[PDB]
C-alpha cells in the first residue's frame, strides 16, 4: 500500500478540483488510490486536489 507519490510530468489542472503540480513534487494521498483520479495533497506546494494516476509513481 503506497500513499506517497512523485510527479513524473508537469500537470496543469483541467477543472478546478484538479491539483496542478510540477514534475518532481511529492504528492500525498488523502484517502485512497482506487480508480484513476486520486485526491492528493502536495508536500511541495500545500495544495490539494485530484491527480491523474498515470502522471505519478511511488516515491521510491
Amino acid at each position: 500500500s503506497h500513499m506517497t507519490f512523485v510527479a513524473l510530468y508537469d500537470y496543469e489542472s483541467r477543472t478546478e478540483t484538479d491539483l496542478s503540480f510540477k514534475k518532481g513534487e511529492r504528492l500525498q494521498i488523502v484517502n485512497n488510490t482506487e480508480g484513476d483520479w486520486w485526491l492528493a495533497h502536495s508536500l511541495t506546494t500545500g495544495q490539494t486536489g485530484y491527480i491523474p494516476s498515470n502522471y505519478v509513481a511511488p516515491s521510491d
Binding site: 510530468y9 508537469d10 483541467r14 477543472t15 484513476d36 483520479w37 485530484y50 491523474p52 498515470n54
Partner: peptide, 8 residues
C-alpha cells in the same frame, strides 16, 4: 506526457 484518464 500521456493523455489523462477518463475524466470525472
Amino acid at each position: 506526457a500521456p493523455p489523462i484518464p477518463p475524466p470525472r
